[PDB]
Design a protein around this ligand. Structure first.
Ligand code: FMN
Ligand code: SF4
Ligand code: SF4
Ligand code: SF4
Ligand code: FES
Ligand code: FES
Ligand code: ZN
Lengths: 233, 108, 220, 435, 187
């Protein structure tokens, strides 16, 4: 028969474990009830649920697709349509840290392309692939609304601003072996933790997130120039 | 067969399964019959072919005492297997694809 | 008249004569109209020919006889009303300014969807003296397929009225002897009518046969 | 014109995101002012404020809110029961160069929270959603914390300030899709479907989220609502112009010294903003720039004095967009940047409609050949014609945005495009690596 | 029933209120090219093949989604150069990635794409680049083979499997040029 996409196809099709164990499904249903409860329509929770399963495993699996389909009353190939549509829903085992270099036009020519090339040569791993240690998964991301901080490198969707090839190489080296260098704006955590956070099941009071130089640039210029803030009533 | 004004060609396609491939690509004509008692030699068939699989030679000596014997099948119409060729049921040339065959980039 | 002559109503995209291979494309409805009445300033010598024909024929007689005038692809067709055909043919042949002495024949064409006008007879006339030519078109219903025979005016129409009869059943009333000329006299039906089947046989092949083209699927 | 900080004024303070700091600067006073007035009163207040949309559309916010049917007074029967109104705050920010919303949310999310509460009261929406892209996880955490604090402080839930208003605000972390920023794709993703734009009509104002009346607003406009509820309308109108009143964030980025977010009145020319930033990267000159994100037609030095407001950019053939102000200097190849933007659009096209889906693929391949040595003279004509065949023909405005860089870059730099035919890109990438 | 007058090209007709421009053109005998439109499916306006020029509208309007309105003036590819250019550009974009499979394609001869590319397409290709490719064919069931390269992503199959039959076991998947009708997994 050989139904569906061929496994060797581009944009790896959903693959992996067929079904979750009973305990895994019990925990997943416990979380999914809370996720469903917060929307007027059940299906509105499909994206968070796809994140939730993406936390149970390192990536979207047929088990996760089936779980979401059963939870929402949808069929498989309805959940899959939404799942394959979004980029954050990775489709291969992701390492402990997803390092995505913003290779969009601005960040790319501000240095981002050089950053990506340097990381590819350093980890010896192409974008989208995972390091043999399984701790870093190199990727290239589109604009992340941190252009003023270009070049910007994301680690599990936490910012690292003004990254140079040496800085990024040091960052990936630290992530792979030992201490993860703190994000310039954000608190770094494992990929599973971020996946759970996207589901809205993680404590929102995380540390970090100082405004940074670029965000303040305008205010600092206004003060230094003693500029009338605005137009007092 | 589509272009034949006299309905003198009968063709039945079939899949080129990896176990038995006769032509590059997905389809090959496994049954191919020309009813030469209906052929008018117009040449619309060859002008119709998109692969040049069908040509018309200069050979003309052809006649039979039997009506059926003049319905020439695939075996009678296939060109003789030349030097360097192999039996039709074999895989495509290594590192080659249907586009390569049509572009003419194949060799014995 | 004065409206476009629809000879067939074609519905569905891609010229499907039936329900169609792909769903959802069969809802188009495109009537197949032949070229309609031409605006009066006809091209070339057609204007002169028509003016002379309308002068020789009385205004009332002209209006009663000439059902329509068409100029298509720089060719002039005159839809001549049945019954009046011999009069206009005589006028065309005899009038010195018209002098269409050479009638090239009669051609039958069948329009099974053209209500009341299924059978058309086409008379290509040529005037060698003026180096002109025109065509007359005479329509007749399938119910009363009668047309006035031009034997007195154009003897060459003999055998043509016969061929056209043999192949369509147009009766060409007044013809000296309207007998089948091509088909045997015992033959049943009129072959070139669209309703008459092609009458072919399947083409024999080893293990298969191809039905005649009229049975197999077509797109128009 | 002065670089007016209003939203940015708190920043540089310790922990400005907290509710305490927000209150220390008249925080949630605007919400009280809103609740003191009628919902239609708030709608008219914002309409007179002239607050135009802060996403790419630029449409008047007041009119957009007014379009919601609310059965004001006219309640012939309860059988129809109306339909719930939904306020969706488009916290998605994925347009290239558009980095004004993420800093605002990360630093002072309570601006957006207060604005969203005010807007929901205005349109009488009992539920509101913050749709925030998932690639800004710090922003997601900050926004969730701010919403939780608002819930604790009685700003959300039921009986807000004993006003009888009820509002439950939900932070939805959307997955990675630029197209989801477009309304009716934001709604489709928020409904648990592919983030593809809907056929319009029906419009979101009548058939929005869950096929109910809905308004989608960019975070910037919502966050600017409270600052106008306080300070009155005349204060807001005292900035910008009659057709573009107020203040906006400009995301100076690229080959500019001191890049960052500059809060300025509308219509401030790029010259003033560069002067404040210290001009283009030292040792180079302005080559081109995007007034809004990549979706907006490129502009060059000749437009350096054009006011950055909707009317001005329209008069120049561009769109103000999200005020992304991406800046690129002589060292950058326009073909290189446009190729990367085309690659982004191809990667981001939802694939629904033939024009965008196929034309972006074709244009990306053409630009790949141009940057390499495989360029051809007819390649430029093909680029322009394909862009024409995409612009105005695609289902949503993403196709138009993809075509815009190509058309504008061709119009302004056909010379450079031709120069690429001579064997590829002459420019050395290292020259533009911003050290 | 409410009836609205309308002008398509130079001709004028009246149709029931709520009629789509493509349906009015069909009734009038004007053949507007169309792939995603289907009379029995709710209009989706995806393929953009049915674009026509409507007076008072800057952009071309997808006739398959534009409801007829009174006094509206519409010019198809037969009487509007802009509409013809839009339709032919859409056809070209529809054919750049299409496989050169007509001889081996089962739909050959009965293919709406072939017919509408003949009637509304460029005579020859401008596309000299690499075509998008998929493994073909792939079975989505015991009965139905899927050739994703020939797919024009008109969504007629998915829209049928959702609206008409309540069996949405196929859906559009992936994104952008990679988008494809699929079943997701072995199901
Ligand atoms: C492809 C595309 C992407 C868009 N992305 C965004 C976005 O990220 N943020 C946004 O606020 N508006 C975005 N928009 C504009 C929205 O359609 C909408 O106008 C806006 O979210 C809300 O309007 P407002 O800014 O007037 O409130 C996008 C539009 C398109 C066509
Ligand atoms: S020459 Fe070829 S096309 Fe012509 S009748 Fe004979 S078989 Fe048919
Ligand atoms: S233009 Fe069409 S294909 Fe591109 S994002 Fe918009 S709807 Fe999707
Ligand atoms: S497979 Fe579906 S989407 Fe693709 S062309 Fe056929 S009907 Fe359209
Ligand atoms: S271009 Fe890199 S964050 Fe926007
Ligand atoms: S048929 Fe109308 S846009 Fe596709
Ligand atoms: Zn270049």
């Amino acid at each position: 028969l050989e139904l569906g996409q061929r496994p060797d196809e581009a944009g790896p099709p959903i693959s992996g474990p067929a079904t979750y164990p009973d305990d895994v499904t019990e925990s997943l249903r416990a979380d999914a009830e809370q996720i469903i409860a917060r929307y007027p329509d059940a299906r509105s929770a499909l994206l968070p649920l796809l994140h939730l399963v993406q936390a149970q495993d390192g990536y979207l699996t047929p088990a996760g697709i089936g779980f979401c389909a059963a939870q929402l009353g949808l069929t498989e190939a309805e959940v899959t349509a939404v799942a394959t549509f979004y980029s954050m829903y990775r489709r291969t085992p992701t390492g402990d840290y997803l390092v995505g270099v913003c290779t969009n036009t601005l960040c790319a020519i501000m240095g981002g392309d050089a950053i990506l090339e340097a990381l590819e040569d350093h980890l010896g791993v192409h974008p989208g692939q995972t390091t043999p240690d399984g701790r870093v998964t190199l990727e290239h991301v589109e604009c992340n609304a941190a252009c003023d901080y270009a070049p910007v490198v994301m680690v599990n969707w936490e910012f690292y601003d003004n990254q140079t090839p040496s800085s990024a190489r040091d960052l990936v080296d630290g992530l792979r072996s030992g201490s993860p260098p703190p994000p310039t704006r954000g608190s770094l955590c494992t990929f599973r933790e971020t996946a759970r956070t996207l589901a809205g099941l993680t404590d929102p009071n995380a540390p970090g997130g100082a405004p940074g130089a670029a965000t303040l640039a305008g205010l600092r210029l206004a003060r230094e120039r003693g500029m009338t803030a605005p137009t007092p009533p | 067969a589509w272009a034949c004004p006299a309905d003198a060609i009968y063709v039945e396609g079939a899949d080129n399964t990896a176990d038995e491939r006769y032509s590059p690509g997905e389809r090959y004509g496994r049954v191919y019959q020309i009813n030469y008692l209906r052929c008018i030699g117009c040449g619309l068939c060859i002008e119709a072919c998109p692969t040049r699989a069908l040509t018309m030679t200069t050979e003309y000596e052809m006649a039979d005492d039997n009506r059926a014997d003049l319905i020439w099948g695939k075996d009678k119409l296939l060109a003789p297997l030349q030097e360097g060729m192999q039996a039709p049921p074999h895989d495509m040339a290594p590192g080659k694809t249907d586009d390569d065959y049509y572009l003419g980039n194949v060799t014995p | 008249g004065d409206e476009p002559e629809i000879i067939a109503v074609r519905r569905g995209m891609f010229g499907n004569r039936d329900t169609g291979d792909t769903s959802g494309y069969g809802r188009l409805v495109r009537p197949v109209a032949l070229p309609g009445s031409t605006p009066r300033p006809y091209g070339g010598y057609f204007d002169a020919v028509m003016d002379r024909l309308a002068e020789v024929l009385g205004e009332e007689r002209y209006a009663m006889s000439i059902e329509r005038v068409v100029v298509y692809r720089d060719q002039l067709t005159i839809e001549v009303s049945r019954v009046q055909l011999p009069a206009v043919a005589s006028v065309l042949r005899d009038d010195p300014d018209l002098r269409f002495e050479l009638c090239l024949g009669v051609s039958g064409v069948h329009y099974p969807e053209d209500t009341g006008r299924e059978l058309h007879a086409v008379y290509p006339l040529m005037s060698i003296t003026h180096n002109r030519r025109i065509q007359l078109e005479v329509a007749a219903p399938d119910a009363d397929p009668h047309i006035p025979s031009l034997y007195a005016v154009y003897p060459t129409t003999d055998w043509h009225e016969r061929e056209t009869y043999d192949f369509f059943g147009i009766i060409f009333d007044g013809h000296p002897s309207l007998t089948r000329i091509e088909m045997p006299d015992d033959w049943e039906g009129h072959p070139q009518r669209k309703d008459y089947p092609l009458g072919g046989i399947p083409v024999e092949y080893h293990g298969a046969q191809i039905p005649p083209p009229d049975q197999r699927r077509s797109y128009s | 014109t002065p670089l007016t900080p209003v939203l940015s004024r708190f920043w540089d303070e310790p922990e400005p995101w907290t509710l305490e700091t927000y209150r220390r600067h008249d925080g949630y006073q605007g919400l009280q002012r809103a609740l003191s007035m009628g919902p239609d009163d708030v709608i008219a207040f914002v309409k007179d404020s002239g607050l135009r949309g802060r996403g790419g559309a630029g449409f008047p916010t007041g009119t957009k809110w007014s379009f919601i049917p609310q059965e004001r007074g006219d309640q012939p029967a309860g059988g129809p029961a109306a339909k719930p109104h939904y306020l969706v705050i488009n916290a998605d920010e994925s347009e290239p160069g558009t980095c004004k919303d993420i800093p605002l949310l990360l630093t002072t999310p309570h601006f957006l929270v207060e604005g969203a509460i005010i807007a929901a009261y205005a349109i009488r929406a009992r539920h509101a959603f913050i749709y925030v892209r998932g690639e800004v996880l710090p922003v997601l955490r900050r926004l969730q914390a701010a919403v939780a604090e608002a819930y604790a402080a009685g700003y959300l839930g039921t009986d807000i300030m004993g006003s009888g208003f009820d509002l439950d605000l939900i932070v939805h972390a959307g997955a990675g899709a630029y197209i989801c920023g477009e309304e009716t794709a934001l709604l489709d993703s928020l409904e648990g479907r592919r983030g593809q734009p809907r056929l319009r009509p029906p419009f979101p104002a009548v058939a929005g989220l869950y096929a109910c009346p809905t308004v989608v607003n960019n975070v910037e406009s919502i966050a600017s609502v409270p600052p106008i509820m306080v300070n009155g309308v005349d204060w807001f109108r005292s900035m910008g112009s009659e057709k573009s009143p107020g203040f906006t964030l400009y995301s100076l980025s690229g080959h500019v010294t001191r890049p960052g977010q500059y809060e300025a009145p509308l219509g401030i020319t790029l010259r003033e903003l560069l002067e404040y930033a210290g001009g283009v990267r030292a040792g180079h000159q302005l080559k081109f720039w995007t007034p809004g994100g990549s979706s907006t037609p490129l502009l060059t030095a000749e437009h350096l004095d054009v006011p950055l407001d909707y009317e001005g950019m329209a008069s120049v053939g561009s769109m103000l967009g999200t005020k992304a102000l991406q800046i690129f200097d002589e060292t950058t190849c326009v073909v290189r940047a446009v190729r990367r933007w085309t690659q982004f659009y191809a990667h981001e096209s939802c694939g629904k409609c033939t024009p965008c889906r196929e034309g972006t693929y074709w244009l990306a391949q053409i630009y790949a050949r141009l940057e390499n040595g495989a360029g051809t003279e007819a390649d430029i004509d093909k680029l322009l014609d394909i862009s024409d065949n995409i612009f105005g023909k695609s289902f949503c405005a993403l196709g138009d945005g993809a075509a815009s860089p190509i058309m504008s870059s061709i119009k302004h730099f056909r010379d450079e495009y031709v120069a690429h035919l001579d064997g590829g890109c002459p420019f050395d990438p290292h020259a533009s690596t911003l050290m | 029933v409410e009836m609205v007058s309308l002008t398509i090209d130079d001709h004028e007709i009246s149709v029931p209120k709520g009629t789509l421009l493509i349906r009015a053109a069909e009734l009038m005998g004007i053949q507007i090219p169309r792939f995603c439109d289907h009379p029995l499916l709710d209009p989706v306006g995806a393929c953009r093949q049915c674009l026509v020029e409507v007076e008072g509208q800057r952009k071309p309007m997808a006739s398959c989604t534009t409801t007829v309105m009174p006094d509206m003036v519409v010019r198809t590819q037969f009487t509007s150069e802009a509409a013809d250019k839009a339709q032919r550009g859409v056809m070209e974009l529809l054919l750049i990635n299409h496989p050169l499979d007509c001889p081996i394609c089962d739909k050959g001869g009965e293919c709406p794409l072939q017919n509408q590319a003949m009637s509304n397409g460029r005579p020859e290709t401008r596309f000299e680049d690499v075509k998008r490719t998929f493994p073909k064919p792939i079975s989505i069931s015991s009965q139905v083979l899927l050739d994703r390269e020939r797919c024009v992503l008109c969504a007629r199959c998915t829209r049928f499997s959702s609206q008409i039959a309540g069996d949405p076991f196929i859906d559009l998947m992936e994104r952008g040029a990679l988008q494809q009708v699929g079943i997701g997994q072995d199901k």
